[PDB]
Design an enzyme around this catalytic site. Structure first.
Site, short mmCIF file in Angstrom:
data_model
loop_
_atom_site.label_atom_id
_atom_site.label_comp_id
_atom_site.label_asym_id
_atom_site.label_seq_id
_atom_site.Cartn_x
_atom_site.Cartn_y
_atom_site.Cartn_z
N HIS A 44 -7.52 -5.91 -0.49
CA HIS A 44 -6.30 -5.17 -0.18
C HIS A 44 -5.88 -5.51 1.25
O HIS A 44 -6.70 -5.49 2.17
CB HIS A 44 -6.64 -3.68 -0.27
CG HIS A 44 -5.46 -2.75 -0.14
ND1 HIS A 44 -4.45 -2.71 -1.07
CD2 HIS A 44 -5.18 -1.79 0.78
CE1 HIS A 44 -3.58 -1.77 -0.73
NE2 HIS A 44 -4.00 -1.20 0.39
N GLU B 93 -8.85 -6.30 -4.83
CA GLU B 93 -8.31 -5.20 -4.03
C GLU B 93 -9.42 -4.30 -3.50
O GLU B 93 -9.43 -3.93 -2.31
CB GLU B 93 -7.36 -4.35 -4.88
CG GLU B 93 -6.03 -5.00 -5.24
CD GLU B 93 -4.96 -4.84 -4.17
OE1 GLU B 93 -5.22 -4.16 -3.15
OE2 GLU B 93 -3.87 -5.42 -4.38
N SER C 179 0.87 -1.19 0.00
CA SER C 179 0.00 0.00 0.00
C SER C 179 0.90 1.23 0.00
O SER C 179 1.79 1.34 -0.86
CB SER C 179 -1.03 -0.10 1.12
OG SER C 179 -2.14 0.75 0.89
#
Length: 566
Positions: free
Chosen positions: A467, A347, A214
């Site tokens: 994610h 995600e 990230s």
């Protein structure tokens, strides 16, 4: 986060504290650093592996007083032995579950972990940079425990860096020496420490790998772009992000005034007077108010965070980002090191909670004009060409008669992750000489082993690989449990850490010694490839055409008449 989950989290924090006592041994050890001796402690894992743990190693002076908002400065050396048997504070931030400000300005520390301080051969060094949108995160082992990597003969290092306005304030006036990116300069100073000191812990300074997820992936990429770090490391892994993602940078030079006003500033908009006020403020007050900094106009323009990585307005000795990252790619030293990139298989499932609270968000799929890249859209987003571009996004993601929340989340996977990855791969092919890049896709779903991001996102019982779900297979955390050796989760830990260690060692992520990898032929992406191939990690390991390719190509089609901007 619900009050019930908040109670469950408090219970887990207490349980974890006592577990960590039971995992502490009475064996301590002293290591050398360039600034003085450090004392670490031998710890166990729930699998009865063991490792030496040094936390709270300073890589910079505490950035307090006149050093607030400035580039990091080298720490003062000490005599005697610094106790590194417990963690230090995290950077000042709003706690992702309790919703209250926590941490300290005294946060410029790194932790070093290894199963053997005097190994028979110098070891690959893996350096993890955490995510959290440049506003949250830490190197505490309740979230980033080294327990899985230390099964193997590597040195693992987890860094902290300044967050929020304290890490990313930026002012135009050169006399004030606050150009921006203090938190990235913290990362630079940490990487320099690692190069100069990892050998004292058994590490090979000629074989360092930086990885992150990230905002940590954007950070790793920034560390591969800046001249400040040229030659400091040897492989990079970008997990769900990079430095050209739309969320990874912003021009925040006018936002210090807005923050000061929210904090009580009564003066005029000049950098000197604004800085003087912010220098006197309590750090908790600034961080608490950061969520209110963006103006109505900036929210309208879809700026996501007020403070973050920025293009610095003037040059300084420590400057990290002198130009936009897209331009920095063109001359970047890190284009010439082995690189691995990947994403999870859903995600955008990360946004499930937001969509449940604000279901009218799905109405943005009616025309999709708000998702058109800003460099292609007219200012009002009403031009016929802009509507045509939005219609292409809509065709890519709206699969039935009526747009759905799942369509929205699928779109989010592309706008924030897959499309920037594609654009980076294609930009970089123009500015590299055959250095390999390898793609993975994390596609393993389980709720038997989880991590705190699932709680943050209210994702209990939600199927699909969101994610940050892969972090549970890399790091121990306070929600984890010991898994059976024959379990699909355990095998996934071994595979994920094994592939990362193999790539860190050799620059090639394939090894026939990883179970299920025996029949894998994993080629890096070539400039001539029209369809990307990736290693898909599910219950099996299989090379596949990237399933997202067709949608990626549809996004790329908006640039057919504007190829100079792609």
């Amino acid at each position: 986060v619900s009050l019930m989950e908040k109670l469950k989290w408090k219970i887990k924090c207490i349980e974890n504290k006592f577990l960590n006592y039971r995992l502490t041994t009475n064996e301590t050890v002293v290591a050398e650093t360039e600034y003085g001796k450090v004392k670490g402690v031998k710890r166990l894992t729930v699998y009865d592996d063991s490792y030496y743990s040094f936390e709270g190693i300073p890589y910079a002076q505490p950035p307090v007083g006149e050093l607030r908002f400035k580039a990091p400065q080298r720490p003062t050396p000490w005599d005697g032995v610094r106790d590194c048997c417990n963690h230090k504070d995290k950077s000042v931030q709003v706690d992702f579950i309790a919703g209250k400000v926590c941490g300290s300005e005294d946060c410029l520390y790194l932790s070093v972990y290894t199963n053997n301080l005097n190994p028979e051969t110098k070891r690959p060094v893996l350096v993890y940079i955490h995510g959290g949108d440049f506003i949250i995160g830490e190197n505490h082992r309740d979230m980033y425990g080294p327990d899985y990597f230390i099964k193997k003969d590597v040195v693992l290092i987890n860094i902290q860096y300044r967050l929020g306005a304290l890490g990313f304030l930026s002012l135009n006036s050169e006399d004030l020496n606050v150009p921006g990116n203090a938190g990235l300069k913290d990362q630079v100073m940490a990487l320099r420490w690692i190069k100069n000191n990892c050998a004292n812990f058994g590490g090979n300074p000629d074989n360092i790998t930086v990885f992150g997820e990230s905002a940590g992936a954007a950070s790793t990429h920034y560390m591969m772009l800046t001249e400040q770090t040229r030659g400091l490391f040897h492989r990079g892994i970008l997990m769900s992000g990079n430095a050209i993602c739309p969320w990874a940078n912003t021009q925040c030079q006018h936002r210090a005034f807005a923050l000061a006003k929210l904090a009580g500033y009564k003066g005029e908009d000049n950098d000197k007077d604004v800085l003087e006020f912010l220098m006197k403020a309590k750090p908790q007050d600034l961080i608490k108010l950061e969520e209110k900094v963006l103006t109505l106009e900036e929210r309208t323009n879809m700026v996501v965070f007020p403070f973050g990585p920025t293009v610095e307005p003037y040059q300084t000795a420590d400057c990290v980002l002198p130009k936009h990252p897209r331009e920095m790619v063109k001359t970047a030293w890190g284009n010439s090191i082995p690189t691995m990139m990947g994403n999870t298989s859903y995600e955008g499932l990360f946004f499930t909670s937001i969509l449940k609270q604000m279901p009218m968000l799905v109405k943005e799929l009616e025309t999709c004009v708000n998702f058109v890249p800003s460099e292609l859209a007219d200012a009002e987003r009403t031009a016929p060409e802009t509507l045509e571009m939005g219609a292409k996004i809509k065709k890519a993601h709206v699969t039935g008669e009526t747009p759905t929340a799942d369509n929205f989340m699928d779109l989010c996977s592309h706008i924030y992750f897959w499309f920037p990855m594609h654009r980076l791969l294609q930009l970089r092919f123009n500015h590299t000489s055959g250095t390999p890049v390898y793609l993975y896709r994390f596609d393993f779903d389980s709720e038997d082993l989880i991590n705190p991001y699932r709680i943050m996102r209210s994702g209990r019982g939600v199927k699909g690989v969101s994610h940050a779900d892969e972090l549970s297979y890399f790091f121990w955390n306070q929600l984890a449990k010991r898994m059976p050796k024959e379990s699909r989760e355990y095998k996934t830990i071994e595979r994920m850490t094994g592939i990362w260690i193999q790539f860190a060692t050799t620059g090639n992520p394939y090894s026939n010694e990883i179970e299920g990898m025996e029949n894998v032929s994993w080629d890096p992406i070539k400039k001539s490839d029209e369809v990307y191939k990736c290693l898909n990690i599910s219950d099996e390991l299989k090379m596949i055409d990237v399933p997202e390719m067709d949608k990626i190509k549809q996004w790329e089609s908006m640039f057919e008449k504007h190829r100079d901007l792609f």
